[PDB]
Amino acid sequence: GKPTVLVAEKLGAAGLALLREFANVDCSYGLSPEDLRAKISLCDALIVRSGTKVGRDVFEASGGRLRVVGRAGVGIDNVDLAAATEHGCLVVNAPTANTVAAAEHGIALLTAMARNIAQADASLKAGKWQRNKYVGVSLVGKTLAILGFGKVGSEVARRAKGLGMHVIAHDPYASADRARAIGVELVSMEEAMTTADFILLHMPLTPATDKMLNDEAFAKMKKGVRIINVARGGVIDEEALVRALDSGVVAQAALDVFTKEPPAADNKLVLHGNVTVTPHLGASTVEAQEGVAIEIAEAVIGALK
Amino acid sequence: GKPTVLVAEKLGAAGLALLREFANVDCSYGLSPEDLRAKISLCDALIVRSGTKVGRDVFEASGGRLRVVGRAGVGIDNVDLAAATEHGCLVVNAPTANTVAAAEHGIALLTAMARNIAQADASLKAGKWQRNKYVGVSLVGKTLAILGFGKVGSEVARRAKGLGMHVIAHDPYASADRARAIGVELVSMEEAMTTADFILLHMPLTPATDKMLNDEAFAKMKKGVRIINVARGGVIDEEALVRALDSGVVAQAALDVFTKEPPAADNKLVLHGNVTVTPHLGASTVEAQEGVAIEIAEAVIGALK
């Protein structure tokens, strides 16, 4: 029994060594839609991370051998998810490993924002010693607002209440009991906008969330509010955040994800003074890398059986 | 009843207005040791932050008018307590208001270093999109060793376990009950060195602690340890820290204090790739500033009664 698993995108040797113990593993890496279509007819399972677009044509082209698609990581946006099961192909993901290291990165964005770790380190490496330019805020007692109470959203909260913040969340799909059991009040969407000193974005990018943080949302906010985006860019109106920081509605902004990766080489948020930008690093911790590998590994393998 | 308080160094206008309700206040900022010896004979109280030297000659020069010296901030290194006590003079300080925004900043240095927030932000801004160079490390389950279990020491432990780390400390003058009461084991010095995935330094600088972090220290540590200093520079042999980063014993280092502030323009720690540096920003939060003003103000006024 030699099941065949095509691994389209780089994968953590920890997991590749689990798959190789339970399957044939093809690691052709980055194939053109046609190469892939040619291979998938001969694969009992496909594993992808983010770049591979498991479209409708990919299921169509397999001819019913492809049983299970393994999405390494958290999101699944790229698997045509309705074709998948229409053709009778299970789709499984690797959420919990990247989830930890992704809230970990949000918190790291929040604290480093709040004290200007980033600008200051640049200022001092550049010889300048400008102690008065980089005075930060505290976190204790500050109200943090979480939009979209996912695993990361609630894992974040848990870390932010450990830093001693008041943490609130808005997400119409959120178990009032789970929230109250970590100490998070579920609040209205206007209450979250107004009363927050800090706002993080953990929302999926749907038509209802697109360009959500636009000029109307920034008006409702408290002045002196700071904002951290670790979910998906473009859920912010990028031009509108450029204008709210230029005014002093938003005091400073911490941005992992963008509307475009790589962002424009002139793109104003990335270049702005009060912004702390990292290049979609949210799940870039060695530990998650190796634990996501092992997760879809065990996930694919358990489907396949 | 008109008391006279000489405030040598800037002070949050909150504090100044409290002091001007209960005394005459001279804000002669930055005097030469002679001008201060001249004034101190006309002053019932002297409030200083970190730069003014309350040496022995000052206590002599005042002739006994001076009743209380107020240390705006945490330590008292600059005040010759020995001489003040001798000349029947009280010393008071502003420990708690800074204490927190110190630990706060310490944590921010930790999380920003773990995830290369500083190096990555400066790269993106520099056009570079280098997603793989800047893979971070998970904090969770890691061992944070706190050398010096002061008020700031324990206060960091609190934030750390809330990020979900395994926090041990070594300070021989620490109540094992306070320690266990916040979930921190107190451990030997060789244990702190060897077991730690992270080491922060909250140690004041004695001839015992001077250049304590030395080549012999670094060999004892676990390879890939990351070191966060927010207490006093010099406790670290800079030359040896650099040689331990360049050799990869020390993974990376987040340094707020230095052996010489402002550091040398060529200083290899400041300019090093794996080092995140801030210019002694430890207490530079707007909250801890206004809060320390009002602390010594109350502290001086109460003594002065």
XYZ file of C-alpha atoms in Angstrom:
610
model
C 0.000 0.000 0.000
C 1.988 2.926 -1.361
C -0.214 6.037 -1.201
C 1.031 8.988 -3.242
C 1.255 12.510 -1.797
C 2.273 15.538 -3.870
C 3.787 18.316 -1.755
C 3.619 21.463 -3.864
C 5.289 23.991 -1.518
C 8.244 23.834 0.928
C 7.569 21.758 3.999
C 9.199 21.137 7.346
C 11.557 18.162 7.206
C 9.995 17.007 10.474
C 6.749 16.335 8.638
C 8.186 15.261 5.289
C 9.782 12.479 7.337
C 6.387 11.465 8.736
C 4.827 11.435 5.279
C 7.713 9.461 3.837
C 6.960 6.824 6.469
C 3.327 6.458 5.272
C 3.389 7.441 1.606
C 5.203 8.201 -1.600
C 6.091 11.870 -1.468
C 6.591 13.963 -4.577
C 8.109 17.323 -3.714
C 7.884 19.106 -6.978
C 7.921 22.646 -5.804
C 6.150 25.446 -7.620
C 4.591 23.883 -10.701
C 2.778 25.693 -13.461
C -0.992 25.101 -13.420
C -0.384 22.579 -16.258
C 2.406 20.548 -14.559
C 0.213 20.214 -11.528
C -2.880 19.256 -13.535
C -0.746 16.572 -15.202
C 0.413 15.189 -11.839
C -2.787 15.278 -9.806
C -4.370 12.431 -11.813
C -1.785 10.194 -10.086
C -1.992 11.531 -6.481
C -4.041 10.278 -3.595
C -3.364 13.539 -1.755
C -2.057 17.042 -2.338
C -0.436 19.285 0.285
C -0.211 23.045 -0.276
C 0.676 26.043 1.839
C -0.524 29.343 0.294
C 0.907 29.978 -3.208
C -0.719 26.953 -4.833
C -4.164 27.675 -6.162
C -6.073 24.417 -5.757
C -8.762 25.497 -8.182
C -11.731 23.750 -9.680
C -9.646 22.587 -12.645
C -7.301 20.796 -10.268
C -10.048 18.541 -8.943
C -11.485 18.120 -12.438
C -8.080 17.075 -13.793
C -7.391 14.390 -11.185
C -10.183 12.122 -12.334
C -11.257 10.994 -8.870
C -7.975 9.674 -7.483
C -7.317 12.771 -5.349
C -8.946 12.015 -1.981
C -7.716 14.657 0.459
C -6.126 18.077 0.075
C -3.884 19.171 2.920
C -3.616 22.879 3.498
C -0.524 23.497 5.618
C -1.361 26.402 7.870
C -4.368 28.349 9.023
C -6.297 29.814 6.083
C -7.801 27.778 3.213
C -8.823 30.680 0.916
C -6.930 29.087 -1.983
C -8.565 25.628 -2.091
C -11.746 25.821 -4.153
C -13.434 24.339 -1.179
C -16.812 23.572 -2.770
C -15.314 21.817 -5.777
C -13.224 19.821 -3.319
C -16.034 17.901 -1.762
C -18.217 17.985 -4.884
C -15.609 15.717 -6.359
C -15.440 13.917 -3.023
C -12.089 15.269 -1.827
C -11.664 15.974 1.912
C -9.756 19.189 2.780
C -7.786 19.411 6.045
C -5.592 22.178 7.538
C -2.818 22.879 10.072
C -4.264 25.666 12.193
C -3.181 25.182 15.786
C 0.586 25.323 15.280
C 0.599 28.609 13.304
C -2.194 30.027 15.494
C 0.018 30.247 18.615
C 2.974 31.794 16.789
C 0.609 34.239 15.039
C -0.867 35.795 18.177
C 2.649 35.640 19.557
C 3.581 37.895 16.653
C 0.614 40.217 17.173
C 1.559 40.850 20.818
C 5.160 41.374 19.683
C 3.807 43.966 17.244
C 1.713 45.647 19.925
C 4.450 46.067 22.553
C 7.152 47.095 20.055
C 4.710 49.624 18.606
C 3.854 51.012 22.016
C 7.462 51.827 23.016
C 8.924 52.554 19.526
C 11.394 49.674 19.729
C 11.655 49.795 15.939
C 12.225 53.485 15.264
C 14.506 53.807 18.286
C 16.728 50.857 17.333
C 17.072 52.428 13.893
C 17.708 55.869 15.397
C 20.526 54.609 17.629
C 22.129 52.330 15.029
C 22.211 55.477 12.915
C 24.340 57.233 15.503
C 21.510 59.517 16.584
C 20.816 59.443 20.334
C 17.340 61.004 20.607
C 15.941 59.912 23.979
C 13.117 62.427 23.901
C 11.888 61.562 20.434
C 10.840 57.992 21.334
C 8.769 58.158 24.527
C 6.116 55.410 24.452
C 2.753 54.579 26.027
C 1.950 52.134 28.750
C -0.253 49.099 28.307
C -1.686 48.492 31.799
C -5.359 49.547 32.030
C -5.421 50.379 28.308
C -8.462 48.948 26.559
C -7.514 46.576 23.765
C -10.189 45.827 21.166
C -10.015 42.553 19.186
C -11.999 42.346 15.946
C -12.819 38.730 15.175
C -12.490 36.413 18.157
C -10.729 33.483 16.412
C -8.259 31.180 18.100
C -5.621 33.825 17.466
C -7.986 36.567 18.583
C -8.597 34.734 21.874
C -5.038 33.551 22.232
C -3.991 37.219 21.787
C -6.481 38.317 24.427
C -5.020 35.820 26.895
C -1.567 37.344 26.348
C -2.860 40.928 26.509
C -4.635 40.339 29.834
C -1.366 38.882 31.070
C 0.233 42.195 30.180
C -2.456 43.666 32.365
C -4.753 45.205 29.806
C -8.502 45.468 29.670
C -9.384 43.269 26.701
C -12.728 43.403 24.807
C -13.835 41.685 21.570
C -16.519 41.981 18.829
C -17.454 39.036 16.537
C -21.157 38.088 16.157
C -20.016 34.452 16.064
C -18.387 34.130 19.468
C -19.373 31.995 22.467
C -20.248 34.441 25.278
C -19.270 31.624 27.686
C -15.766 30.988 26.269
C -15.174 34.753 26.236
C -16.362 35.269 29.805
C -14.200 32.272 30.830
C -10.939 33.911 29.794
C -12.143 37.310 30.996
C -13.199 39.021 27.766
C -16.416 40.987 27.478
C -18.069 40.569 24.095
C -19.012 44.103 22.954
C -20.789 45.942 20.147
C -19.027 47.088 16.991
C -19.476 50.745 17.835
C -18.369 50.183 21.454
C -15.193 48.459 20.298
C -14.368 51.296 17.862
C -14.914 54.109 20.338
C -13.658 52.926 23.744
C -10.346 51.319 22.621
C -6.816 52.514 23.179
C -5.546 49.589 21.056
C -7.288 47.711 18.233
C -6.068 44.537 16.599
C -7.415 43.036 13.388
C -8.007 39.301 13.394
C -10.719 39.143 10.718
C -10.988 37.101 7.519
C -11.148 39.126 4.316
C -14.743 38.743 3.047
C -16.907 41.219 1.058
C -18.390 42.436 4.392
C -14.936 43.137 5.892
C -13.258 44.701 2.815
C -11.988 48.273 3.316
C -13.800 48.142 6.661
C -11.381 50.464 8.442
C -12.224 53.366 6.175
C -12.716 57.037 6.896
C -15.987 56.490 8.809
C -14.465 53.952 11.216
C -11.447 56.178 11.997
C -13.773 59.028 12.932
C -15.670 56.896 15.479
C -12.415 55.850 17.165
C -10.808 57.500 20.130
C -8.055 59.868 19.186
C -4.717 58.429 20.249
C -5.703 54.910 19.245
C -3.126 52.412 17.988
C -3.894 49.647 15.553
C -2.311 46.272 14.764
C -3.140 44.222 11.639
C -2.024 40.570 11.689
C -5.039 38.987 9.919
C -5.315 40.286 6.317
C -4.418 43.621 4.773
C -6.952 45.529 2.785
C -9.439 44.790 5.557
C -7.974 48.255 6.174
C -8.438 51.040 3.651
C -4.737 51.714 3.176
C -5.167 55.252 1.851
C -7.563 56.009 4.749
C -5.084 54.863 7.410
C -2.425 57.023 5.741
C -4.709 59.994 6.329
C -5.656 59.140 9.954
C -1.997 58.763 10.972
C -1.125 62.013 9.151
C -3.771 63.762 11.241
C -3.240 62.111 14.603
C -6.483 60.195 14.770
C -4.413 56.997 14.803
C -1.237 57.581 16.786
C 0.744 54.657 15.376
C 0.076 51.469 13.410
C 1.647 47.964 13.412
C 1.158 46.081 10.150
C 2.191 42.480 9.385
C -0.163 41.850 6.425
C -0.843 44.119 3.443
C -3.280 44.563 0.596
C -0.342 43.537 -1.625
C 2.644 41.330 -0.760
C 5.223 42.657 -1.711
C 3.739 46.097 -1.080
C 4.526 48.917 -3.481
C 8.078 50.182 -3.259
C 6.645 53.707 -2.610
C 3.678 52.492 -0.572
C 3.068 55.109 2.062
C 2.128 53.050 5.116
C 5.226 50.866 4.811
C 7.346 54.006 4.546
C 5.531 56.000 7.257
C 7.104 57.202 10.488
C 4.537 55.929 13.006
C 4.190 52.490 11.435
C 5.856 49.250 12.395
C 5.752 46.882 9.412
C 6.916 43.276 9.228
C 6.634 41.256 5.952
C 3.821 38.812 6.706
C 5.900 37.152 9.420
C 2.942 36.148 11.554
C 3.625 32.412 11.505
C 7.383 32.736 10.844
C 8.607 31.070 14.043
C 10.799 27.983 13.595
C 8.589 26.209 16.159
C 5.387 26.701 14.125
C 7.174 25.925 10.865
C 8.147 22.545 12.263
C 4.801 22.056 14.003
C 2.698 22.884 10.964
C 4.722 20.395 8.988
C 3.926 17.761 11.560
C 0.277 18.804 11.753
C -0.893 18.383 8.124
C 1.455 15.417 8.124
C -0.645 13.737 10.750
C -3.789 15.253 9.187
C -3.283 14.044 5.634
C -2.138 10.647 6.884
C -5.258 10.188 9.010
C -7.612 11.144 6.215
C -5.876 8.815 3.808
C -6.305 5.736 6.070
C 5.684 78.787 56.420
C 7.644 78.932 53.140
C 9.863 75.870 52.393
C 12.456 75.923 49.626
C 13.009 73.014 47.201
C 15.742 72.985 44.538
C 14.723 70.827 41.585
C 17.887 70.232 39.583
C 16.525 68.209 36.633
C 13.331 68.369 34.532
C 10.198 67.234 36.259
C 6.695 66.544 34.935
C 4.609 69.686 35.329
C 2.139 67.638 37.408
C 4.877 67.221 39.999
C 6.051 70.818 39.747
C 2.562 72.135 40.385
C 2.151 69.886 43.429
C 5.457 71.129 44.765
C 4.537 74.777 44.112
C 1.417 74.277 46.258
C 3.552 73.273 49.284
C 6.862 75.100 48.648
C 9.030 77.621 46.874
C 10.472 75.792 43.891
C 13.662 76.727 42.065
C 14.016 74.884 38.771
C 17.615 75.769 38.007
C 18.260 72.890 35.569
C 21.860 71.723 35.081
C 24.221 73.559 37.395
C 27.954 73.186 37.796
C 28.883 71.473 41.092
C 29.946 74.886 42.392
C 26.612 76.573 41.633
C 24.868 73.716 43.376
C 27.152 73.874 46.434
C 26.260 77.567 46.571
C 22.496 77.038 46.346
C 22.193 73.999 48.638
C 22.796 76.141 51.747
C 19.520 78.007 50.978
C 17.396 74.894 50.279
C 15.362 72.693 52.578
C 14.986 69.967 49.912
C 16.755 68.866 46.737
C 14.965 66.825 44.040
C 17.169 65.032 41.486
C 16.592 62.451 38.777
C 19.705 60.597 37.531
C 22.264 63.163 36.319
C 22.862 65.407 39.319
C 25.571 64.133 41.672
C 24.434 64.479 45.321
C 28.043 63.943 46.394
C 29.476 64.410 49.852
C 30.609 67.984 49.170
C 26.964 68.909 48.628
C 25.917 67.690 52.085
C 28.840 69.547 53.634
C 28.190 72.754 51.687
C 24.551 73.089 52.773
C 25.384 73.628 56.437
C 22.414 71.545 57.576
C 19.564 73.399 55.913
C 18.941 70.501 53.551
C 16.496 68.079 55.187
C 15.495 65.738 52.354
C 16.879 64.699 48.973
C 14.318 63.448 46.446
C 15.451 60.914 43.829
C 13.005 61.106 40.910
C 13.068 57.523 39.746
C 14.064 54.106 40.832
C 17.650 53.859 42.116
C 19.765 56.139 44.357
C 23.257 55.521 42.981
C 24.053 59.247 42.626
C 23.035 60.210 46.196
C 25.824 59.579 48.765
C 23.271 58.043 51.170
C 26.219 57.426 53.462
C 26.822 61.172 53.724
C 23.141 62.180 53.760
C 22.377 59.914 56.702
C 25.532 61.278 58.365
C 24.447 64.912 57.957
C 20.927 64.149 59.269
C 19.265 64.218 55.872
C 16.497 62.030 54.545
C 16.521 60.403 51.108
C 13.274 59.576 49.238
C 12.556 58.211 45.777
C 9.969 57.470 43.091
C 10.353 53.697 42.743
C 6.957 52.358 41.826
C 5.858 54.629 38.998
C 8.953 53.859 36.919
C 9.286 50.189 38.023
C 6.338 49.219 35.831
C 7.087 51.115 32.615
C 10.559 49.551 33.017
C 9.339 45.948 33.176
C 6.841 46.921 30.456
C 9.675 48.089 28.197
C 11.786 45.052 29.142
C 9.012 42.736 27.882
C 8.612 44.788 24.693
C 12.357 44.379 24.103
C 11.935 40.630 24.572
C 9.026 40.153 22.179
C 10.452 42.557 19.575
C 13.765 40.701 19.620
C 12.230 37.250 19.431
C 10.437 38.194 16.192
C 13.020 40.613 14.715
C 10.451 43.418 14.687
C 13.286 45.942 14.630
C 15.460 44.406 11.906
C 12.471 43.521 9.719
C 10.789 46.915 9.878
C 14.001 48.654 8.844
C 14.421 46.161 5.959
C 10.869 46.570 4.575
C 11.193 50.383 4.765
C 14.476 49.858 2.860
C 12.541 48.274 -0.028
C 13.862 44.843 0.874
C 11.167 42.114 1.067
C 13.139 39.324 2.826
C 10.433 37.189 4.527
C 12.796 34.295 5.298
C 15.728 36.129 6.792
C 13.580 37.210 9.735
C 12.063 34.002 11.104
C 11.479 34.426 14.844
C 11.275 32.142 17.861
C 8.349 31.016 19.923
C 8.189 32.340 23.474
C 5.833 29.676 24.850
C 7.390 27.032 27.070
C 10.754 28.816 26.829
C 12.721 29.439 30.036
C 13.075 33.095 31.001
C 15.721 33.569 33.682
C 15.479 36.773 35.718
C 18.790 37.749 37.340
C 17.791 40.114 40.108
C 14.298 39.531 41.482
C 13.593 43.143 42.374
C 10.302 44.895 41.979
C 11.039 45.190 38.278
C 12.288 41.598 38.211
C 9.074 40.075 39.550
C 7.057 42.609 37.567
C 8.594 41.203 34.353
C 7.999 37.600 35.454
C 4.298 38.511 35.738
C 4.088 39.722 32.144
C 6.230 36.786 30.991
C 4.152 33.968 32.425
C 1.182 35.753 30.836
C 2.948 35.298 27.514
C 3.230 31.741 28.709
C 6.908 31.255 29.526
C 8.589 29.185 32.189
C 10.034 31.855 34.477
C 12.799 31.107 36.966
C 14.785 33.699 38.898
C 18.040 33.902 40.842
C 18.482 36.677 43.463
C 19.712 35.472 46.892
C 17.744 38.323 48.526
C 14.270 37.261 47.399
C 11.432 35.834 49.474
C 10.869 32.282 48.341
C 7.250 32.894 49.383
C 6.801 35.927 47.096
C 8.502 33.890 44.380
C 6.304 30.811 44.748
C 3.302 33.107 45.246
C 3.623 34.411 41.677
C 4.730 31.083 40.232
C 8.467 31.666 39.964
C 10.962 29.118 41.161
C 14.057 30.558 42.825
C 17.115 28.709 41.528
C 20.895 28.509 41.705
C 23.094 30.741 39.620
C 24.433 27.913 37.473
C 20.861 26.769 36.948
C 19.792 30.222 35.723
C 22.705 30.193 33.250
C 22.362 26.719 31.826
C 18.581 26.208 31.701
C 17.569 29.510 30.162
C 16.346 30.154 26.647
C 16.050 33.844 27.613
C 17.979 35.845 30.208
C 16.983 39.310 31.287
C 19.196 41.353 33.599
C 17.694 43.326 36.436
C 20.878 43.693 38.520
C 22.251 46.899 40.035
C 25.924 47.487 39.365
C 28.331 46.549 42.198
C 31.958 45.389 42.044
C 30.387 41.925 42.277
C 28.171 42.433 39.221
C 30.685 44.442 37.139
C 31.367 42.684 33.819
C 29.768 39.586 35.355
C 28.392 38.476 31.973
C 31.828 37.389 30.691
C 33.280 34.744 28.393
C 33.074 32.254 31.255
C 29.413 33.177 31.708
C 28.524 32.731 28.045
C 30.117 29.283 27.773
C 27.921 28.098 30.682
C 24.736 29.300 28.936
C 22.571 27.255 26.606
C 23.507 27.864 22.940
C 21.015 30.181 21.290
C 20.149 32.059 24.468
C 18.820 35.587 23.995
C 19.708 38.305 26.503
C 17.661 41.365 27.430
C 19.443 43.984 29.556
C 17.306 46.819 31.006
C 19.121 47.218 34.358
C 22.660 48.620 33.982
C 25.262 48.144 31.242
C 28.779 47.118 32.234
C 27.306 44.199 34.205
C 27.931 42.772 30.726
C 31.434 42.567 29.218
C 30.428 44.240 25.930
C 33.463 42.871 24.056
C 32.487 39.356 25.191
C 28.798 39.734 24.375
C 29.842 40.763 20.866
C 32.179 37.800 20.553
C 29.341 35.498 21.775
C 26.876 36.853 19.206
C 29.416 36.607 16.402
C 30.090 33.000 17.469
C 26.413 32.203 17.842
C 26.481 31.279 21.508
C 24.217 34.218 22.195
C 21.470 34.126 19.564
C 20.548 37.809 19.825
C 20.574 40.599 22.437
C 18.117 43.384 23.324
C 19.935 46.157 25.188
C 18.351 49.317 26.704
C 21.279 50.345 28.953
C 24.926 50.677 27.986
C 28.306 51.002 29.693
C 28.500 54.544 28.339
C 25.459 56.569 27.319
C 25.580 57.851 24.596
C 27.642 54.892 23.425
C 30.638 55.178 21.170
C 29.711 55.916 17.555
C 31.546 52.708 16.461
C 30.253 50.548 19.272
C 29.928 46.978 18.067
C 26.903 46.042 20.201
C 24.950 49.098 19.134
C 25.678 48.484 15.444
C 25.442 44.677 15.554
C 22.900 42.850 13.425
C 21.403 40.592 16.093
C 21.189 43.353 18.719
C 18.125 45.452 19.350
C 19.127 48.674 21.089
C 17.141 51.484 22.624
C 18.600 54.674 24.187
C 17.861 54.013 27.899
C 14.126 54.395 27.175
C 13.290 52.084 30.070
C 11.123 54.594 31.910
C 10.071 56.745 28.940
C 6.300 56.199 29.067
C 4.076 59.253 29.396
C 2.358 57.489 32.313
C 5.560 56.737 34.221
C 6.772 60.282 33.589
C 3.836 62.232 34.999
C 3.586 59.468 37.618
C 7.115 59.852 38.944
C 6.790 63.641 39.094
C 3.768 63.246 41.416
C 5.532 60.507 43.373
C 8.639 62.383 44.645
C 6.471 65.478 44.949
C 4.331 63.636 47.509
C 7.493 61.951 48.829
C 9.379 65.198 49.393
C 6.335 67.048 50.770
C 5.612 64.285 53.280
C 9.224 64.221 54.486
C 9.266 68.014 54.629
C 6.294 67.855 57.019
